[PDB]
């Protein structure tokens, strides 16, 4: 994973007042190389890829067992309310009969 852009590292301009922007994908995915810059120059993207290659070439077989998930689980009943999907795919079909004055 390469986090390119300031909005992918820490949220960037939206780190302060956006109510829906995830402040960095390191909260979601493990990032190998962080690439700062708003529209980073394509040469800087190539440099980040070069650093990623520098880290990739250092890998051994032991790193493979660092990569498989541990896969722990815990299951309980929730007694929530189960509801069907709101977006069912029905759109603009028989629309002219949906006036309902």
């Amino acid at each position: 994973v390469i986090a390119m852009g300031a909005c992918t590292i820490t949220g960037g301009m939206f780190s302060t007042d956006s109510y829906s922007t995830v402040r960095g994908v390191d909260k979601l995915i493990p990032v190998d190389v962080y690439l700062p810059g708003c529209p980073p120059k394509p040469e800087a993207v190539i440099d980040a890829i070069t650093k990623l290659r520098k880290k990739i070439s250092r890998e051994i077989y032991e790193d493979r067992i660092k990569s498989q998930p541990k896969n722990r689980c815990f299951t309980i009943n929730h007694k929530f309310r189960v509801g069907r999907s709101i977006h069912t795919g029905n759109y603009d079909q028989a629309l002219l009969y949906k006036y309902k004055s």
Partner: protein
């Protein structure tokens, strides 16, 4: 055939044809689109909320993040809302520079529309072909403004800085080269039999439907309507230059493609005319230019609506001030967000492979559809 025969596929945020993160819930009856439901908002950063609690000199970097292909149009609308509210005049040199930059951004936006459109049709080489010249446009912008995209060049009552030495001849040479490049594009693409047979009769839109749906720009102009907000509202200096509003009678995607090519040519003519008759004098307004604490632009207490002819249509700002630095309300009228709502009507009873052609005909980028 109502259910268990109709395949509901989520051609969603991660799809090569989906420009950005647009999602389509498409119901297919053997490669025939029964209907489609557009789901947007995967890029909704709440930019209208961030428009408040931010001064204009702070909000200007945020502006280029809607319509990131045509950034100067968003910057122009953001800087001409409050400068119309405060009755700030713009010098003639700054206005000419603004016209040149807007037309260059229109050229770049039409290019980077043509790329993904032909990619969705199936041709990948035109993407690199447009990028060869969009890099030159980026070089001109970086020489003038300082960055390729997110220029932060437009300012209230003028521009950030004057054009650097040796910019006029560079832009003229770019125009001379780009006319040849556009002729090469029309030679390669326009009469191709596969391109025509993929494009000739898809997405026929009536003029009345285009008016009612709120379409603008090349979408509305490709239905027999000669409606350009540069000539209607007398924006900047567009009344001084000789140019023609590109409109076509038929409603298909080929009309939109021809309109965008002709708009690129007319834009090039506008840069040539503007650079031939560039004026002198100042560029920043000396009246507004005045360790000490520095206030921002205090907006007046009245409502305002300002429009611009973006390459995707009409981009608008509805601004309500509060006699303070932070605006009370900042509503963005996005051309793509309104042009997108006609897509389920067009793709209905069409085929699966035609969805790419229809969606590439509409200039949709997802950073401007949501805010």
């Amino acid at each position: 055939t109502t259910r268990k025969d109709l395949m509901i596929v989520n051609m969603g945020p991660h799809h090569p044809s989906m420009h950005g993160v647009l999602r389509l819930i498409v119901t297919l009856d053997g490669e025939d689109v029964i209907d489609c439901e557009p789901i947007v908002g995967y890029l909704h950063r709440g930019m209208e909320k961030i428009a408040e609690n931010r001064t204009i000199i702070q909000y200007l970097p945020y502006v280029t993040r809607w319509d990131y292909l045509a950034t100067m149009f968003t910057e122009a609308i953001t800087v001409n809302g409050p400068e119309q509210l405060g009755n700030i005049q713009v010098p003639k040199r700054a206005s000419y520079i603004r016209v040149i930059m807007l037309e260059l951004s229109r050229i770049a936006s039409h290019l980077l529309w043509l790329g993904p459109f032909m990619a969705d049709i199936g041709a990948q080489t035109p993407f690199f072909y447009i990028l060869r010249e969009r890099e030159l446009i980026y070089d001109l912008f970086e020489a003038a403004t300082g960055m390729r995209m997110m220029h932060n060049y437009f300012r209230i009552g003028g521009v950030a800085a004057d054009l650097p030495y040796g910019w006029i001849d560079k832009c003229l040479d770019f125009c001379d080269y780009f006319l040849i490049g556009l002729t090469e594009y029309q030679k390669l693409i326009t009469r191709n039999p596969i391109f025509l047979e993929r494009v000739e009769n898809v997405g026929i839109i009536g003029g009345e439907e285009a008016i009612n749906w709120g379409l603008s720009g090349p979408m509305l102009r490709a239905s027999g309507i000669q409606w350009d907000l540069r000539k209607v509202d007398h924006y900047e200096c567009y009344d001084e230059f000789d140019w023609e509003v590109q409109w076509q009678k038929e409603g298909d995607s080929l009309a939109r493609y021809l309109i965008r090519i002709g708009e690129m040519a007319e834009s090039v003519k506008i840069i040539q005319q503007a650079l031939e008759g560039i004026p002198g004098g100042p560029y920043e307004n000396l009246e507004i230019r005045r360790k000490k604490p520095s206030p921002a632009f205090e907006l007046s207490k009245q409502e305002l609506y300002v429009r611009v002819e973006a390459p995707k249509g009409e981009l608008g700002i509805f601004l309500i001030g509060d006699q303070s630095v932070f605006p009370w309300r900042w509503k963005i009228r996005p051309p793509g967000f309104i042009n997108l709502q006609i897509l389920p009507q067009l793709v209905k009873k069409m085929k699966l492979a035609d969805i790419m052609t229809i969606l590439g005909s509409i200039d949709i980028i997802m950073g401007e559809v949501d805010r």
